[PDB]
């Protein structure tokens with residue numbers, strides 16, 4: 281029967297560095313892929329506590345869980361079980377840069393995610409390295425087919441604790457491991473929130489809702 285069930289779990293591992301500080305994270309998540317929501321519980325397993333804002337990592341922890349209207353081919357779901365890769369660059373307005381690569385697959389009944397991230401050039405006195413952030417505004421990820429993959433572009437807005445925001449220009453390329461039907465251009469509306477964290481953000485739970493529309 282259907283490869284992807286109405287309820288699905290995942291496991292994730294991230295290896296990363298930000299301004300040369302190495303860390304690892306392991307987590308697990310679950311959600312309802314056709315309804316477009318999911319939760320994740322992440323643990324810093326190496327390199328904790330992190331000396332920077334969790335918020336730059338949160339968008340790196342799951343595109344199988346986007347609700348898609350029936351007339352827009354669901355590139356992500358169609359790619360399983362083999363799955364898809366994605367690569368991302370986030371150019372923040374004060375010059376920090378985060379580059380990410382990710383592999384998604386369906387193995388032994390659950391999604392498996394492997395992420396590698398490199399952040400550099402965050403100013404030492406900036407909101408990222410000083411942990412002065414408080415979560416992302418809703419995003420519209422503009423998806424368009426290009427050069428045989430699905431490209432997404434976002435101008436993301438990170439809220440500041442004091443009031444105000446901090447901007448990032450994001451480009452992602454999502455590419456199935458086997459050829460799959462690409463959609464036309466469309467938009468994925470996304471909202472991500474940290475719903476729980478321990479004091480030093482070595483255990484973090486986050487909730488995301490995502491839905492495609494024309």
Ligand SMILES: [Mg+2]
Pocket residue numbers: 387388389390
């Ligand atoms: Mg299993």
